[PDB]
Paper text:
The UbiD decarboxylases are prevalent in microbes and reversibly decarboxylate (hetero)aromatic and unsaturated aliphatic acid compounds using the highly modified prenylated flavin mononucleotide (prFMN) cofactor. Here, we characterize I3C decarboxylase from Arthrobacter nicotianae (AnInD). We provide structural and biochemical insights into AnInD, revealing the enzyme to be strictly specific for indole-3-carboxylic acid (I3C). Structural insights from crystal structure determination combined with small-angle X-ray scattering (SAXS) measurements reveal the enzyme undergoes an open-closed transition as a consequence of prFMN domain motion, an event likely coupled to catalysis.
AnInD structure in complex with prFMN was solved by molecular replacement. The cofactor complex structure was obtained after soaking AnInD crystals with freeze-dried prFMN powder. The AnInD structure contains an entire hexamer in the asymmetric unit. Each monomer of AnInD is composed of an N-terminal prFMN-binding domain connected to the oligomerization domain via an alpha helical linker. The C-terminal extended loop projects out and forms interactions with the prFMN-binding domain of the adjacent monomer. Electron density of bound prFMN and associated metal ions could be readily observed in the active site of the AnInD–prFMN complex structure. The phosphate moiety of the prFMN is coordinated by two metal ions, identified as Mn2+ and Na+ as these were present in the sample and by analogy to other UbiD enzymes. The prFMN-modified isoalloxazine ring is placed adjacent to the conserved E(D)-R-E network of ionic residues that is conserved in the UbiD family. A potential hinge region located on a central alpha helix (G310) can be identified, which connects the prFMN-binding domain and oligomerization domain. The crystal structure of AnInD remains poised toward the open conformation as frequently observed for other UbiDs.
Author numbering:
A (entry chain C), B (entry chain E): 1 to 184, 187 to 454
Write the structure that this text describes.
């Protein structure tokens, strides 16, 4: 249950019968994403064997099911956030130095075609996206002053066969490395089709891996041995050796061009706007490369939840007794709604749980508290807790004029109202709140034919 | 797409591949319900071929999927509430008189064993239920003064081989017929394994079918020809001829015995308490009888929602422009949460929608309003509307000290607080609230191998 590269992942999923093979030709323009969309969240990913008759298949849906990600590393869905956090803790405490290797030993350096981005089966995802996007690509970039690596993930729109337009949010580390090159232009690699270890490194936030620190070793914790890197053709760039595809790239500051629209976590479109142009100097491919894309939605909600929930639980359970679990629900775009599950020990702690949760995760708009006997990850079950337990008069806590996330239109200019719901039963515990219960049953204990 | 009896239903489901056959022996005590519970809500019912080696199999889960009920009558899940209401309208306007038939022509009169309730595979459902229950049984009872029929559905607990304890809520028509016999004791039949038409007749509320009116003709609207009835052995009683099983029963007023606990719609237990004892005078069975039981949960939520939603929609759309649909959600126990979907035409109507909905359905605790582009029946999607569109400051409307449903512990003594959520986008419509969209795609148009 360790994985060197995406090949390992796909074979494991294929073997486990958690792969959906779409054998028919599909169009990279809208149709592919459309099919993905009908499967979003089920316990399998999707391999498109034939995209516009490309030799290169595309994989989508790797991140939309915690059960699937768990199966790849042998952990239950419920234990995955702790699993990942424990591994990031081990990296912080004893980092594994990368292994630099010779160009002709690096599987990704197998081929170097003349740069034609339109030869790649890059999907146009949502119906109003401003073009085809690579959105699963991990950017590795060296500090122009100190050579220290930074690993981030960023959406790149294809303009033409050799140009991308990239979105760099405010306070991103890639942003800061560009500021340094603009005191001299910034080279980097875009590594498409990486294993989850690289994905989690890329998505690890600033306060876990500061600017002056190399988060890529996080990936080493999810594979035997160290992360393999390789000198590019640049040579200011460093390439991920075990990537399916890797793009050597260069970008000048103060050189903007229209990119977007694209889907945001909110489920709304980004504004099309002038954002940095990046020019693709070279292309490297394994033999039998699969192109990896992410469908905006649960794939992103789970990326954020798996990395963020353990810290949040840690912060709330430290301030409040009897906390059991915290969910950054998919309904809330893995960012705007937290459900906190606790075992009450005294009246009043449920409200402290609301304060602690809102204080620990500034983007949150809603917090719901529920008891140990409610499934915090089932929105039906939280609705039920609201319907039978919430006191609308005393259990709704509203915070006005507070800081929040500006992408969410409930928070114009990073400013608005938050609300907590205390959907707990009354304490001390009373019979009138004791839930009915059906015997728990192993279905393998019986012969069951379900439809034919 | 018409059905004379339960046999018709089961064959149609079997043919349609919407039947789950559990072939292994299962225990009527807890185990059976436990298996049902793992399937609750999916697009199939469950036939248990072998319950404690009884010759009689049991059917469960007929009502937990509107898609399944729709498939039986050729209507989409979305059109089923209107379908049922239209048919009850036709019955109110032009009722079909019943067909009385000779004892030896009535399939249910095939056999009349010595009365042994413990020979029947009657499930003990929830782990703290006070015994085995028949809960899908339709009671037919004649007015002791006027002979006019009343059809209701009531939970009966088995005490011993010839005695049941029944729960009769306040203001039930069976209650009123008992008050009349107690001016002279009340006979009636308990008809188990009936088609949905009989179920909907039984569940049709007081204000649609008054005390002095015979609701059983409603069933005639869901079958070719009239409802077949037959003289019992009593002979103050009337039996449903096409039932799988029918129990001739007698009950004296002021003759109480401990019954319960049992699951209520809330998902909590009823208080065990002195409630009327009923004594089973005779038992009738088809050959090839199947015993029909209901799992407390979605089976009950859909019974209430399918009968109630059209009236509620009718009442709200009359007072407010742009109403499209109203859901009595399963999270709210088909009773405590209504989601109202509308197409906004002017600021302010969303709040009138909250007032109209609360006014039209007194049990409601929560109302949520959403726009045309949110799936009101998907709790994830309503959570999303809450996360991105609700203004917590101006969009939460709280009503205190109002009437509500006493079974819900948020409303002690039929008194408490209600709350409406206005999770609509801003009007006039703005780009920042336009949801991303993936192309709609027919999956039958492609070769897809899904796991193996
Ligand atoms: C998980 C994830 C994170 C995205 C992201 C996506 C995903 C799935 C996409 C691909 C679906 C859409 C695009 N994303 C962008 C993004 N940050 C950014 O500046 N621009 C982006 O366009 N991020 C966030 C960024 O990669 C993380 O916050 C890193 O932790 C930042 O790295 P750093 O701390 O080294 O700066
Ligand atoms: C759908 C449904 C309705 C139940 C019901 C259930 C279901 C599934 C069960 C079986 C799961 C639990 C028990 N139920 C009872 C009940 N009414 C009552 O007085 N006592 C009950 O125990 N009802 C409702 C009752 O039958 C309806 O209110 C009828 O409209 C009454 O007919 P009436 O208007 O002629 O009185
Ligand atoms: Mn960093
Ligand atoms: Mn009636
Ligand atoms: Na990072
Ligand atoms: Na009735």
């Amino acid at each position: 249950h360790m994985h060197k590269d995406l090949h390992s992942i796909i074979d494991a999923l294929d073997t486990a019968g958690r792969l959906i093979r779409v054998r028919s030709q599909v169009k990279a323009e809208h149709e592919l994403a459309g099919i993905a969309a009908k499967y979003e969240g089920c316990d399998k990913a999707v391999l498109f064997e034939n995209v516009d008759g490309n030799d290169i298949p595309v994989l989508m849906g790797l991140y939309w099911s915690r059960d699937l990600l768990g199966s790849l590393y042998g952990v239950d869905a419920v234990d995955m956030p702790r699993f990942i956090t424990s591994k990031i803790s081990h990296w912080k405490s004893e980092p594994t130095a990368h292994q630099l290797i010779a160009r002709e030993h690096a599987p990704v350096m197998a081929h170097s075609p003349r740069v034609d981005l339109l030869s790649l089966p890059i999907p146009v995802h949502a119906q109003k996206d401003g073009g085809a996007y690579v959105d699963a690509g991990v950017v590795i970039a060296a500090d122009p002053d100190t050579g220290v690596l930074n690993t981030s993930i960023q959406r790149f729109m294809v303009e033409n066969e050799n140009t991308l337009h990239v979105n760099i949010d405010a306070g991103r580390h890639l942003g800061a490395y560009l500021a340094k090159a603009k005191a001299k232009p910034l080279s980097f690699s875009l590594n498409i089709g990486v294993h989850p270890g690289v994905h989690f490194a890329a998505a690890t936030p600033s306060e876990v891996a500061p600017l002056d620190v190399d988060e890529l070793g996080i990936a080493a914790e999810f594979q035997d041995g160290p992360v393999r890197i390789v000198q590019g053709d640049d040579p200011r760039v460093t390439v991920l050796a075990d990537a399916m595809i890797s793009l050597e790239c260069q970008m000048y500051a103060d050189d903007l061009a229209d990119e977007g629209p694209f889907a945001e976590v909110t489920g709304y479109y980004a504004e099309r706007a002038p954002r940095p142009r990046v020019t693709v100097t070279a292309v490297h491919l394994q033999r039998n490369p699969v192109f990896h894309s992410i469908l905006s939605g649960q794939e992103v909600f789970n990326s954020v939840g798996l990395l963020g929930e353990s810290a949040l639980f840690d912060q709330v359970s430290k301030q409040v007794p009897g906390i059991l679990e915290v969910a950054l629900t998919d309904g809330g775009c893995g960012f705007y709604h937290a459900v906190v599950q606790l075992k009450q020990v005294r009246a009043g702690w449920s409200k402290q749980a609301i304060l602690a949760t809102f204080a620990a995760f500034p983007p949150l708009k809603m917090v719901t508290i529920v008891d140990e006997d409610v499934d915090l990850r089932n929105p039906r079950d939280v609705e039920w807790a609201m319907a039978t337990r919430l006191d609308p008069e005393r259990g709704i806590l509203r915070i006005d004029d507070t800081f929040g996330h500006g992408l969410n239109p409930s928070f114009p200019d990073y400013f608005g109202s938050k609300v907590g719901f205390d959907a707990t039963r009354s304490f001390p515990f009373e019979e009138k709140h004791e839930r009915i219960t059906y015997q728990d049953v192993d279905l393998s204990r019986f012969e069951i034919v379900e439809g034919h």
